[PDB]
């Protein structure tokens, strides 16, 4: 299965998380069919940050959920709000676009 839950930030609140996110409409084949929906993707991944430190995610990768709570279908505000709340434990689940 393509997605893995990665925890970003368990030590290092001084340094940046090391990644940026982006919103785009993702069309996937779901139980509903081909459905295009708001989705968050990795926009930039920065070396030196926790994202690169885990190095398990890539910029092409698509975000599924954060801390156990789905972001697939939420608004960019809602998902960022997750991340701000999950600042002590940012767990993001992504799937690579080029599969795993």
CATH number at residue 80: 2.30.42.10
Number of residues assigned to the chain:
100
Report whether 94 contacts 61 (CB < 8 A). yes
Report whether 100 contacts 2 (CB < 8 A). yes
Element (H, E) at 80: helix 76-85
The boundaries of the domain holding residue 63 are 1-100
Report whether 41 contacts 63 (CB < 8 A). yes
Q: How many domains does the chain have?
A: 1
Q: Where are the alpha helices (DSSP H) in 34-97?
A: 50-54, 76-85
Technique behind this structure?
NMR
């Amino acid at each position: 299965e393509t997605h893995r839950r990665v925890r970003l930030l368990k030590h290092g609140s001084d340094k940046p998380l090391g990644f940026y996110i982006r919103d785009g409409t993702s069309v996937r084949v779901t139980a509903s069919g081909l459905e295009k929906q708001p989705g968050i993707f990795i926009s930039r991944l920065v070396p030196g940050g926790l994202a690169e430190s885990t190095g398990l995610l890539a910029v092409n990768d698509e975000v599924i959920e954060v801390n156990g709570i789905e972001v697939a279908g939420k608004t960019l505000d809602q998902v960022t709000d997750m991340m701000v709340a999950n600042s002590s434990n940012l767990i993001i689940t992504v799937k690579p676009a080029n599969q795993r």
